[PDB]
Amino acid sequence: ETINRLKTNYIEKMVPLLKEEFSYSNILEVPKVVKIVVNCGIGDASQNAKGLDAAINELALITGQRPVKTKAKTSIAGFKVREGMTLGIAVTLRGNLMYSFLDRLINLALPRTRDFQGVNPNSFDGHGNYSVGFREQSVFPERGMDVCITTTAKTDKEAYKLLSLMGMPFR
RNA sequence: UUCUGGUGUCCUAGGCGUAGAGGAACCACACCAAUCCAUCCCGAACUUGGUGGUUAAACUCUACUGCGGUGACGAUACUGUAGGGGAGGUCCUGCGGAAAAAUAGCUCGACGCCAGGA
Ligand SMILES: [Mg+2]
Ligand SMILES: [Mg+2]
């Protein structure tokens, strides 16, 4: 019912709770979410403009922020592309948007996925960061995407402990 | 004369890593706000204006020779010069010069200026 749940629930309840878990000598050693990078790659984006200009608006309503036409780092003929042409669709979420986006993730989009049985807890990279893959975006109440969550954690255990508190149903 | 910060020159370039110290002041980060300004998206960075929590990260100081960097003397190779062998490939001698490599060893910088503090 409150305005910002995660921002208030984190600073008040989680930081005293997560500090007691690992017994950090300082409060600043606690991890926290830095950003959420939402990628959406389309190889055939160079062909059409309607499918490009439309999908850019689809993600914007999901995030409340414009995507960015991500360009190629180098040309290659195996996938018939050229340098400087747009291939990916990306955006950066920081501050309150990443929390508001996470509220729309665990409670709106992630439950509505067909045949849902929890997300893989082995998706951590080994340095506290976490990633998610989608096939559809209509689960958001308004094609796939690679949501990349960043965190200041060194190991994955405190991250798994961190993410699990803010929902994130793991099998 | 020392401590902190700022700013340099010299230099064998003085770093990585490990183990400690620092918060009064100083430096830094963290927290909040956003139309002077900014984002091929995002107040992260950049810019204003605020709260002072923390030395966690950075940075500063103290130590070492584990990596790294540095590095001989001596000897030998090579070589100038005057000569001499061998069918040739190439080799030897006298006078003079003289390494690289490796090892020992050295190395966790040296010296200034301004402000503040003692
Ligand atoms: Mg010698
Ligand atoms: Mg040598």
From Swiss-Prot:
GO cellular-component term (any): chloroplast
Q: Where in the cell is it found?
A: Plastid, Chloroplast
Membrane-crossing residue ranges in chain numbering: none
Keywords for this protein: Chloroplast, Plastid, Ribonucleoprotein, Ribosomal protein, RNA-binding, rRNA-binding, Transit peptide
- For the keyword Ribosomal protein, the answer is yes
Q: List the disulfide bonds.
A: none
| Top-level division of the source organism's lineage | Eukaryota
> Which Gene Ontology BP terms does the record give?
translation
Q: Which GO terms describe its molecular function?
A: RNA binding; rRNA binding; structural constituent of ribosome
Primary location: plastid
> Which family does the record claim for this protein?
Belongs to the universal ribosomal protein uL5 family.
Q: How does it assemble?
A: Component of the chloroplast large ribosomal subunit (LSU). Mature 70S chloroplast ribosomes of higher plants consist of a small (30S) and a large (50S) subunit. The 30S small subunit contains 1 molecule of ribosomal RNA (16S rRNA) and 24 different proteins. The 50S large subunit contains 3 rRNA molecules (23S, 5S and 4.5S rRNA) and 33 different proteins.
Q: What does this protein do?
A: Component of the chloroplast ribosome (chloro-ribosome), a dedicated translation machinery responsible for the synthesis of chloroplast genome-encoded proteins, including proteins of the transcription and translation machinery and components of the photosynthetic apparatus.
User: What is the official name of this protein in its record?
Assistant: Large ribosomal subunit protein uL5c
Q: Which organism is it from?
A: Spinacia oleracea
